[PDB]
């Protein structure tokens, strides 16, 4: 005897979802504290953040010409030293000045510092996204150098 009169398939769907959620709560309660919180919240959350950031934002590999132009990262923790090739995720509205400040930690940068991509110098009042689209399409490797000349 499939189905009952006066009852709707949508009501049955609600019933089923309630059953599933109650069972999930029971199984989460009767589980190890050591494993369940990690496996249910921290790995999903990290994976979500990473995948969303990669699939949505757009990033750039940043290099610097000379060691004298490297930033001072001695004080901030988990990164005591600059390394070239760092992947850096930015927003579409970011400019070269904002990028430079982000690199140098809101501190006094050196003089006549400029950004290039495939040999092509960027203006500082330029959107990084459009500048890359123009000069280095699908090769976002940026380089920071000193333009004395």
């Amino acid at each position: 005897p499939l189905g009952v009169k006066g009852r709707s398939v949508f009501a049955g769907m609600r019933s089923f979802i309630g059953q599933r959620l109650g069972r999930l709560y029971d199984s989460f309660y009767y589980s190890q504290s050591s494993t369940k919180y990690v496996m249910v919240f921290l790995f999903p959350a990290g994976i979500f953040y990473t995948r969303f950031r990669a699939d949505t934002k757009l990033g750039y590999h940043v290099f610097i010409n000379e060691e004298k132009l490297y930033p001072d990262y001695s004080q901030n923790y988990f990164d005591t030293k600059w390394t070239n090739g760092r992947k850096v995720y930015l927003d579409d509205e970011t400019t070269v000045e904002q990028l430079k400040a982000q690199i140098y930690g809101g501190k006094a940068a050196p003089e006549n510092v400029k950004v290039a991509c495939r040999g092509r110098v960027f203006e500082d009042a330029d959107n990084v996204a459009m500048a890359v689209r123009a000069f280095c399409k699908r090769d976002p490797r940026l380089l920071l150098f000193q333009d004395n000349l």
Binding site: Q32, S33, S34, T35
Partner: protein, 49 residues
């Protein structure tokens, strides 16, 4: 039947080649009382009394 029992034992039992016995910090009732015979006795005399 023997294959059934051997499969389930190999999967569930605490052994030197454990499949499922892994990441154990809070044990279930059976394994707890099998490893800690002192507590099985105490928990059992209390229950009967």
């Amino acid at each position: 039947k023997q294959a059934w029992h051997s499969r389930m034992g190999k999967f569930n039992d605490r052994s030197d080649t454990p499949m499922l016995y892994a990441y154990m910090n809070e044990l279930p009732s059976w394994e707890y009382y099998d490893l800690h015979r002192s507590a099985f006795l105490e928990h059992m005399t209390y229950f009967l009394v």
